[model samples]
Target: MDPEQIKTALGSGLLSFPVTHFDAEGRFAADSYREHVEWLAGYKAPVLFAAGGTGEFFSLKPDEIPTIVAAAKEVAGETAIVSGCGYGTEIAVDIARSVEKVGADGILLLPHYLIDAPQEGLYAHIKKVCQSVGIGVMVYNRDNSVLQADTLARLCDECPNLVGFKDGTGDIGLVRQITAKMGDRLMYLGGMPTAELFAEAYLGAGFTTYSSAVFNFVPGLANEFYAALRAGERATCERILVDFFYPFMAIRNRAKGYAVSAVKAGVRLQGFNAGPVRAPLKDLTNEEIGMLEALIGTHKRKAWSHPQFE
Candidate 1:
């Protein structure tokens, strides 16, 4: 896809982080991953965020990304796939090129590994990756990789392919500034974990979309909630929020890495072979699974059974 076309495709709808499934032997299970991608494509999320933070981009090897991207492209059909790229600038540029080579429509540029840089260095790092790939690049702004509005605006002017700003950091003032200054020069995504909780606020501050970790399992509800959010149907959004999202977040907050682990658990509960998350990220305990089971049950009864699906 053209870089501009990738921008248009992702800016207006729900983005999903489909968890990377690993086999019992701790290998990336391509068949299971493909099955999950095919399932998510049915819901028509604007973009499938393959190998994102929730997908364990940190755990995946460089060579493994292309295979995952290719599997997503094979099954995603009309939906665009945005592969995640990170580490230092050189490795990031290499990964971005590989993602493009395997036919990802765009790249979600995750934070550089484990270090902070001044705005100028950050600009140079992101600019190089954008220059290396023909596909659109959306920077994930969080932790060590936060960008000021001025710095991001400069990138917008300098790199045409630098097309998105996804905020994992919940800085309202900064977000407002970026939106106010850049306007539509970059598409803004609400990228905080369990982003649905913050969607209304982010939208008010000028983000057009959010990445849904829950969408890996409950895609129907994810899509319905996003539709409500887009139409400004606060009543429906609140109803779903009160019933499902809040409780889900309660569980997600209980663990250090449940943000990804919990979503993988949901996928397993949904009957996919979405085995455990990577080691450094712990899996849900039996007790946590019980909590999630009850949550899923309530979701099925209330949110999922609502008139939207009927």
Candidate 2:
């Protein structure tokens, strides 16, 4: 597969769905994963995140990496699978190599595990992963491994194979600075869960993709809100943004890891029939579920509205 061509296959855009593992029964539901992968790719999503934190990458058994990615690749076909290699450099490299063997298009390296790596160490950790395999490298920049704009500009220059950076850290100032400097050479995804709020600005600042956890359930809503915003239809975009998106986030912010938990619940709410999040991520509390139920009820096949907190 062509290197730069993978970027082009993104076509007009890219949809990233962080994979969900396990059944509501809590057994590792490795069997049905391909169906989920195909379902998401049917939306023509370009990237599949196999086991990032949201994908439960950190919480899963190390052996599960290959298992999960192998299943995902069955349906991935031509679309790129950016398997998330998280935790630390050594294990990450091990995980990334598994994906390469399975024919994944790329590796999305997550922050080094349980450590606050300084800039030099972080860069070297990334470099090690990049050299570990021939797959394209898209580094995830967030929390434990957040990169400054200058650092990303520097990382971009240092790592020749570095294809992109996913800034889930929720720092827009850093985004603007990196975009201004890095510009064309690297693809930047607004990694924040609420990235659409700033997707237009990021687009204007020259960033193209936003890795959407929100799309896991409401791909249509996410796609419509994002498309309208990208097309200069600000009013309609903002209408949906406020209507469904913001209050959804408000409920999302009500819990720890609600970012991911909320998504799995939302998918269940929308009638996709996906299962609960695996261990360590508690189900939405009954109250939270009630709130989510109310929000899901408001989902019109038409119209736009989000209720404020009571």
Models, CA RMSD each: 4.8, 5.0
lDDT of 2 at 263: 80
What lDDT would each prediction earn against the true structure?
A: 0.88, 0.72
Off by over 4 Å in 1: 298-310
Counted clashes in each candidate structure: 0, 2
TM agreement with the true structure for every prediction:
0.95, 0.88
Candidate that scores best on lDDT: 1
Alpha-carbon error at 148 in model 2, in Å?
3.3
- Which pairs of residues clash in candidate 2, taking residues 3 or more apart in a chain or in different chains? 51-57, 87-113
Deviation of model 2 at 233, angstroms: 0.5
Candidate 1 lDDT by residue in tens digits, 152-184: 988999899888889999999989999999998
Q: Point out the worst 10-residue segment of candidate 1 by lDDT.
A: 298-307
lDDT of 2 by residue, 70-135 (tens): 777777766676677877778888887887887777777778878887887887788788788876
Question: What TM-score would candidate 2 get against the native?
Answer: 0.88
Error at 35, model 2, angstroms = 2.9
